[PDB]
Ligand binder design. Structure first.
Ligand SMILES: CC/C=C/CCCCCCC[C@@H](O)CC(=O)N[C@H]1[C@@H](OP(=O)(O)O)O[C@H](CO[C@@H]2O[C@H](CO[C@]3(C(=O)O)C[C@@H](O)[C@@H](O)[C@@H]([C@H](O)CO)O3)[C@@H](OP(=O)(O)O)[C@H](OC(=O)C[C@@H](CCC/C=C/CCCCCC)OC(=O)CCCCCCCCCCCCC)[C@H]2NC(=O)C[C@@H](C/C=C/CCCCCCCC)OC(=O)CCCCCCCCCCC)[C@@H](O)[C@@H]1OC(=O)C[C@H](O)C/C=C/CCCCCCCC
Ligand SMILES: CC/C=C/CCCCCCC[C@@H](O)CC(=O)N[C@H]1[C@@H](OP(=O)(O)O)O[C@H](CO[C@@H]2O[C@H](CO[C@]3(C(=O)O)C[C@@H](O)[C@@H](O)[C@@H]([C@H](O)CO)O3)[C@@H](OP(=O)(O)O)[C@H](OC(=O)C[C@@H](CCC/C=C/CCCCCC)OC(=O)CCCCCCCCCCCCC)[C@H]2NC(=O)C[C@@H](C/C=C/CCCCCCCC)OC(=O)CCCCCCCCCCC)[C@@H](O)[C@@H]1OC(=O)C[C@H](O)C/C=C/CCCCCCCC
Ligand SMILES: CC/C=C\CCCCCCC[C@@H](O)CC(=O)N[C@H]1[C@@H](OP(=O)(O)O)O[C@H](CO[C@@H]2O[C@H](CO[C@]3(C(=O)O)C[C@@H](O)[C@@H](O)[C@@H]([C@H](O)CO)O3)[C@@H](OP(=O)(O)O)[C@H](OC(=O)C[C@@H](CCC/C=C/CCCCCC)OC(=O)CCCCCCCCCCCCC)[C@H]2NC(=O)C[C@@H](C/C=C/CCCCCCCC)OC(=O)CCCCCCCCCCC)[C@@H](O)[C@@H]1OC(=O)C[C@H](O)C/C=C/CCCCCCCC
Ligand SMILES: CCCCCCCCCCCCCCCC(=O)OC[C@H](COP(=O)(O)O)OC(=O)CCCCCCCCCCCCCCC
Ligand SMILES: CCCCCCCCCCCCCCCC(=O)OC[C@H](COP(=O)(O)O)OC(=O)CCCCCCCCCCCCCCC
Ligand SMILES: *C(=O)CCCCCCCCCCCCCCC
Ligand SMILES: *C(=O)CCCCCCCCCCCCCCC
Ligand SMILES: *C(=O)CCCCCCCCCCCCCCC
Ligand SMILES: *C(=O)CCCCCCCCCCCCCCC
Ligand SMILES: *C(=O)CCCCCCCCCCCCCCC
Ligand SMILES: *C(=O)CCCCCCCCCCCCCCC
Lengths: 138, 523, 138, 138, 138, 138, 138
């Protein structure tokens, strides 16, 4: 269960605490909901944990050669269903925001859905860093 | 080209040592080399500082580059003193050969540039740093500067002996003289090794290396799946060593071992040996202390060709070692162990690897006496021939009816199937290493795997079949034991790792098996 | 299971969140369907997975050497069929779009078919990053 | 079966979706049919899958020593036929197209034949990338 | 034994034979006698040589644990006495000479005691080298 | 045995044959006899040869523990005598020569004694190299 | 048996064949006979080759402990003789030649004795290289 829990504007990673971040302002347009995929492309651990559980379940049926076949089709069926579930525990709700900075521009940034319900037309405060931008509301 | 300066006799050879073909465009390498075939030579004219610097007139209109090679020659300065500070162990002798201008010679900075760097490959400096005679303008020096006991603890886990500890103190500089003093201690199921060790790497100035080994090998059998006998042995060996190639070595020395053979589970294979030496205790009861003191001469050889230390896949590695006592100790014997290794990569991209390690041995007691049984060879196990239980291959013993006991009605040679080892050993294994899949292909070139077909054949060169009909002739020349499987080895911050699964496909009755084995820590 | 699921306009990876993306505008022409093939060149995961399962299905016939023949013919036919199916679950529908930026140009980009339906003639808000682009419809 | 399927104008690698592709226009001359190779020159996988199935097909004949001859001759023959048949499962049809851009030039590019059939004299919309070019007909 | 017997003007090392040495002249003042240490400071070989001889002379008193104590006390005592006697085998009588070069200077050099006895006021010739100097009397 | 036989003017090594050596002429004064030491400092190998021989000669006294003391005392005594006899195998009679180069200078050189018996006042032909000098009479 | 058989004016090594070497002329004065040394100072091979042969010779005399002492005295005696005969079998007869180049100089060069008997005054040619010079007659 890799951690897509630092992708909000209401949570910070401890790498970025006790540091200085520049502040800009902005007005917001066109919020809309967008999921987020996180983690690895392969899901190497969802395989193994799903493999052995599918393996030892095979040993429960049959006997002789027939068990030895079932203790394997259980292995790869468990192997696929593993990656098929790890990649589903990371689908996380989120939003993407068009914002018109008061400088006069437009940029857009996407964040994990949190407690605060944004609106199309509001005031936000961008915390800026080395190309990491959090959009707090107010 | 152009020459502007005094070359002291290279003025015409510009188009021969430093030539190119006209029309070749402005190059930073094939035009700078024209500068740099006379930038190093001129220290062969005794000239100390060969300066070559050429700044063309870069012409763009119809594109010719008119080179202008200002070469001014150095002068004739000499080699008075070579001076090292702060280091009480490094010598002005070896740190002269690893440089390229001897003492008392025409000297130059640019042709001592072939010397300064290699001095650091000693493995003990952090930096290797690099004079006209002070206030005298003719004679000259070459100078250098240098900037210069940590415990270690090992805890492992395994299949062959499970838990496994290491702990010892190493200090590779004894008070400032280069002596390598190291101590080690290991404990697991069958043996506990607690050794002290010393070495002087330069006995002769030219390379001879003398080491004196104080060891102690408090061993035990039963936990190691063998038959029963207990050994508390102490001994001490000293060996010389002289380099000959940097691809080779050689050694010789005198080695005194002292053993306390006791607590034997009566059985023919060792009771042949007891008679021939002269000890015949009770043949079914186990209160007996056979004591040996063996002096024994020893020797060796080596070879290294691998390019990368870690996860190596190139070169060829060899080993030889033998041994013989003087015929003036307790038991007299000799021993010959040969080793091999070969990592053949088939192409430069280096993803297909070929490896196979051949090992041979042979021992004998000389004057009709017999090799001590605790010195035999053992085959079968994780580290040598995967798939078969550790030590399990080797013609098994024959227990006597002792206290196979007379409570159940034991009145003969109870045929047993317990591994004991043997004296002639031959193991080959051809291994065919293949890429690492299933992980991100950014870093899918690390965690190594291979498919393998390992053989192993130890037999009793003196085992009898005239006297043992119901038993086979346990000296068959082709009782091979192949096996195959898979295993995955790699690095991770918790030490050296591998996991395995090897199916024993071929074997004989009486040969156990062990499909699966692992390694974390040390084996 | 190769994860070619982040190719939509409704899904973002965990690296392209909380980072600033420039916004440009455009009109749209020449939408046409395309198939997206995602993953490895080798398919060296379902190749073994089909190989083992195709092997154990070999021990279950014949007897003696005639068995040991089939316990390998099943392997490579099982091994080969492994790739043939894995590469059949990485095919994904998608679209090809010829967008005119109001800068005055044209570019094209392809995406995994999502839930919105693009049309020939519409306004789209090209979101840009370090040479990464998505096309939200509005 | 090395995945040489993304060499059409109807299938894209996942590596080049959601990226910016320039558009050029041109007319077309001299379409001619060509074949395309893909994969390895040595075909290591076909070697194993021929070697084992030629080995275990040797064991079915003879006994003693003449068994041990056929069960290696069959292995080497299978090893040859392996590379022989793998590199005949990659010969795929294709086309070579010379096209004249409105710039005033000529280039040719080679693609895997799909379903649509080009014509001698037409209009094709080039998609350009870091030296990747595709041809769509319209 | 360290061989510091070559520090004289009546022997030479093999590294200073068949080389070229410049010759200066001088008058001599302030001769005084000095001792000269030489070689290792660690004295490793005296330690071992005294230690084994103090150990095997421990096995000859008492029996049982009363002998295991003596065979260590004797070992350490012999180990210390080894250094105490080896470093007293390198002590060597010597002289130390101050001399005025006719160049006009004053230098002083220390040297092994030899056969000729120097005098306060004489003539000497300074065999020079790369800072190595020998003072023959004449 | 270290070969201290190349330090003469009647022997050359293999690294000074077939090489170009300069020539100068000189007048000679003041020859005096001098001994020459050479080799290592520790009598490197003769120590082992003395120690083993002195050790095996230790088994030939006494018995039990009282032998095992002698088999060590003999080893230390033989080790000491080894160095003490190897160095006395390296002394050699020799000469120390003053020669006035015709250039107008004076230098000294030391050299293994040979057959020719030099004289104060004679001519010699100084062979030079990269700072290696030999002296021959004629 | 070190092969210093390349150090004549009548034998060339392999590394200096089919290469361009300059020619300088000259006449000759003062030929005299000289011996040549070639090899090492450690003689690590002659020592072992004499050692084993002198050691096995010990096993022929005596019995019990008296044998195990002779089989070490013989070993070190063979060790001494090994170096004493190896390094006396690398001596080679040779010559030392002064030559006056026509360019106007005088140089010295030393060579192994061959067949031709030089004379003081003769024309000999210097086949010169990067600091290796061979003096052939005429
Ligand atoms: C699909 C939907 C669902 C279905 C899924 C079901 C799957 C699971 C099955 C479940 C039940 C199963 O248990 C049934 C069973 O196995 N039942 C079997 C079971 O009985 P029970 O279960 O108890 O009922 O076991 C018995 C065991 O039989 C024999 O046992 C002997 C030793 O065992 C004994 C003994 O006698 O000593 C028995 C006993 O004594 C005991 O003590 C044991 C002791 O324990 C230790 O030995 O020993 C062996 O002698 P040995 O050890 O010294 O070798 C012998 O080996 C032998 O016999 C050696 C054989 C082996 C060679 C045969 C073919 C090779 C190809 C050659 C040319 C290629 C074409 C170009 O050789 C021969 O038999 C000689 C045959 C000559 C003619 C062959 C034709 C080829 C040319 C045609 C040309 C056409 C041109 C167009 C062996 N034959 C044998 O075990 C059997 C052997 C006989 C040959 C039959 C003809 C097949 C021809 C079709 C192929 C044409 C190709 C175009 O059959 C097989 O090895 C299976 C073959 C595997 C397929 C491999 C081929 C794929 C390769 C791909 C290449 C790209 C069989 O009777 C039963 O079979 C039977 O009841 C037969 C059955 O009723 C019906 C017929 C089946 C045949 C097709 C199978 C293919 C499947 C492929 C899977 C991927
Ligand atoms: C479409 C095709 C697909 C194929 C499969 C589909 C269907 C088949 C399934 C079932 C049928 C099959 O099971 C039949 C069978 O196996 N039948 C056999 C089976 O019985 P079951 O079926 O189980 O009941 O097994 C039994 C085994 O028989 C014999 O057993 C002896 C030991 O057994 C004994 C004992 O006495 O100790 C007693 C026994 O009872 C038992 O106890 C065992 C015990 O277990 C342990 O000892 O021991 C062995 O002696 P040993 O221990 O000392 O070694 C002996 O091998 C011996 O004695 C030693 C043999 C071996 C010599 C081979 C060298 C030839 C060189 C070829 C190059 C040409 C020019 C340079 O030598 C001889 O036997 C002397 C023969 C001389 C002629 C050889 C051929 C050369 C011709 C060209 C010459 C040039 C001039 C033109 C062995 N012969 C043997 O096992 C057989 C031996 C005989 C030679 C065959 C003649 C024609 C072949 C034509 C091929 C090429 C020609 C152009 O053959 C073979 O080993 C296989 C040869 C393979 C050659 C491959 C070449 C490479 C190809 C690469 C292509 C690029 C036989 O009874 C049956 O055969 C017989 O009753 C007699 C019969 O006639 C011969 C058998 C046929 C073999 C040919 C097929 C191979 C083709 C390739 C496959 C990929
Ligand atoms: C929510 C959770 C859901 C479920 C999960 C967990 C539940 C746990 C409950 C526990 C209850 C348990 O006690 C049940 C049990 O098995 N209990 C078993 C236990 O008794 P207990 O009650 O436990 O005390 O033990 C007994 C012993 O079993 C037998 O042992 C023999 C050897 O041992 C013997 C002997 O020498 O005879 C006997 C024994 O007494 C003892 O003496 C031993 C001794 O120890 C020394 O050996 O020796 C074997 O011969 P051998 O080894 O020498 O060769 C023999 O199998 C044999 O010799 C050979 C076998 C094998 C035949 C191969 C066919 C596979 C299908 C391929 C089709 C596609 C082709 C393209 O065949 C047979 O046995 C006869 C088969 C007839 C039909 C064959 C063709 C089918 C075609 C289908 C096509 C469909 C198309 C649509 C074997 N049969 C056997 O063990 C039984 C054999 C029967 C065939 C069933 C149908 C097969 C199709 C499956 C799905 C259909 C797909 C559409 O089956 C099996 O072994 C399981 C095999 C696994 C199959 C995996 C398939 C891969 C695909 C997976 C997809 C993901 C069994 O009777 C009991 O089973 C029985 O009482 C039968 C009972 O009803 C149960 C049957 C199980 C099947 C369902 C699941 C399997 C899928 C695996 C998924 C992970
Ligand atoms: C994703 C690809 C994974 C591929 C691995 C699948 C291998 C299937 C193994 C089947 C073993 C049957 C052999 C004999 C049957 C028998 O009698 O089996 C019986 C015996 C144990 O029973 P006893 O106690 O009676 O000995 O052995 C076993 O059961 C062995 C372990 C079976 C379960 C292991 C689960 C599969 C392997 C672990 C997965 C690792 C992931 C790797 C990913 C790359
Ligand atoms: C520098 C300080 C180093 C100090 C180390 C000293 C170690 C002493 C250990 C005592 C061993 C007792 C063993 C068991 C008793 C027994 O009954 O032992 C019995 C057996 C044999 O005697 P029996 O005939 O009585 O059985 O073994 C011995 O007697 C062993 C020899 C003892 C003497 C060795 C002297 C010390 C080793 C050399 C010094 C190394 C210093 C190196 C420093 C760099
Ligand atoms: C974070 O999520 C870490 C991932 C650890 C691996 C997950 C293991 C899940 C395996 C589930 C297997 C279900 C099989 C059911 C049979 C069809
Ligand atoms: C991600 O999706 C992981 C790869 C999935 C591997 C699935 C393997 C399927 C095997 C099907 C078996 C068919 C074999 C038929 C042979 C006769
Ligand atoms: C992608 O296509 C990988 C394919 C892996 C190899 C499969 C080829 C099958 C080999 C057949 C061997 C023929 C056997 C001949 C026996 C005489
Ligand atoms: C060069 O001089 C090498 C010397 C090697 C050590 C020599 C030491 C002599 C042994 C002294 C023994 C004294 C024993 C004291 C016991 C208390
Ligand atoms: C080159 O010269 C090598 C010489 C090697 C040693 C030669 C001398 C042997 C040692 C003398 C042994 C004397 C024994 C006296 C015992 C008290
Ligand atoms: C080239 O010469 C290689 C070196 C080989 C070593 C030669 C050894 C000569 C053997 C002399 C043995 C003398 C024995 C005397 C014993 C008393």
């Amino acid at each position: 269960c890799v951690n897509n829990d630092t992708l909000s504007g209401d949570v910070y990673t401890a790498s970025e605490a006790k540091q200085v971040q520049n502040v800009s302002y902005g007005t917001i347009v066109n919020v809309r909901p967008v999921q987020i995929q996180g983690g690895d492309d392969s899901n190497v651990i969802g395989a193994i944990g799903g493999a052995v559980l599918g393996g030892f379940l095979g040993n429960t049926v049959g006997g002789g050669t027939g068990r030895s076949l079932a203790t394997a089709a259980g292995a790869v069926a468990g192997g696929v269903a593993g990656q098929g579930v790890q990649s589903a525990m990371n689908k996380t709700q989120g939003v993407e925001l068009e914002i018109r900075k008061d400088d006069g521009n437009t940029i857009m940034v996407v964040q994990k859905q949190g407690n605060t319900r944004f609106s199309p037309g509001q005031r936000v405060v961008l915390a800026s860093n080395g190309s990491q931008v959090t959009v707090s509301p107010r | 080209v152009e020459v502007s300066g005094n070359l002291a006799g290279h003025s015409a050879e510009i188009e021969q040592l430093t030539k190119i073909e006209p029309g070749e465009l402005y190059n930073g390498t094939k035009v700078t080399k024209m500068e740099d075939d006379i930038k190093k030579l001129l220290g062969r004219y005794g000239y100390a500082y060969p300066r070559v610097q050429s700044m063309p007139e870069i012409n763009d209109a119809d594109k010719t580059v008119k080179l202008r090679v200002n070469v001014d020659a150095g002068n004739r300065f000499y080699v008075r003193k070579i001076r090292f500070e702060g280091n009480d162990t490094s010598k002005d002798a070896v740190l002269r050969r690893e440089m390229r201008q001897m003492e008392g010679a025409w000297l130059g900075s640019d042709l001592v540039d072939q010397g300064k760097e290699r001095l650091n490959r000693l493995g003990f400096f952090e930096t290797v740093d690099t004079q006209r005679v002070p206030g005298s303008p003719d004679q000259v020096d070459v100078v250098y500067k240098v900037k210069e006991g940590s415990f270690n603890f090992g805890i492992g886990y395994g299949t062959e002996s499970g838990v496994s500890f290491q702990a010892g103190v190493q200090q590779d500089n004894w008070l400032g003289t280069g002596y390598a003093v190291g101590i080690n201690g290991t404990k697991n199921d069958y043996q506990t090794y607690a050794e002290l060790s010393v070495t002087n790497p330069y006995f002769t100035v030219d390379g001879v290396s003398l080491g004196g080994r104080l060891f102690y090998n408090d061993f035990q059998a039963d936990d190691a799946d063998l038959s029963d006998y207990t050994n508390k042995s102490y001994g001490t060996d000293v060996t010389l060593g002289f380099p000959i190639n940097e691809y080779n070595s050689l050694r010789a020395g005198l080695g005194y071992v002292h053993n306390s053979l006791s607590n034997m589970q009566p059985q023919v294979a060792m009771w042949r040996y007891l008679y021939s030496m002269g000890e015949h205790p009770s043949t079914s009861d186990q209160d007996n202390s056979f004591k040996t003191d063996d002096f024994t001469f020893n020797y060796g050889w080596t070879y290294n060709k691998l390019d990368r230390g870690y996860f190596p896949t190139d070169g060829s590695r060899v080993n030889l070692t033998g041994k013989v006592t003087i015929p003036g100790s307790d038991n007299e014997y000799y021993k010959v162990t040969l080793d091999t290794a070969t990592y053949v990569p088939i192409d430069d991209d280096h993803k297909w690897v070929v490896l196979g390690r051949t090992r041979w041995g042979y021992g004998d007691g000389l004057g009709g006496k017999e090799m001590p049984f605790y010195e035999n060879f053992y085959a079968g196990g994780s580290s040598t021939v995967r798939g078969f239980q550790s030590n399990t291959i080797g013609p098994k013993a024959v227990y006597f009816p002792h206290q196979c006991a007379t409570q159940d009605g034991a009145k003969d040679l109870c045929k047993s199937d317990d591994a004991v080892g043997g004296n002639a050993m031959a193991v080959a294994s051809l291994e065919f290493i293949t890429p690492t899949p299933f992980i991100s292909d950014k870093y899918a070139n690390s965690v190594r795997t291979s498919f393998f077909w390992d053989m192993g054949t130890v037999w009793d060169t003196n085992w009898d079949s005239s006297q043992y009909s119901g038993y086979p002739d346990y000296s068959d020349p082709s009782n091979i034991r192949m096996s195959a499987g898979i295993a995955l080895q790699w690095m991770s911050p918790l030490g050296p790792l591998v996991f395995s699964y090897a199916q024993p496909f071929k074997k004989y009755d009486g040969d156990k098996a062990e499909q699966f084995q692992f390694n974390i820590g040390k084996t």
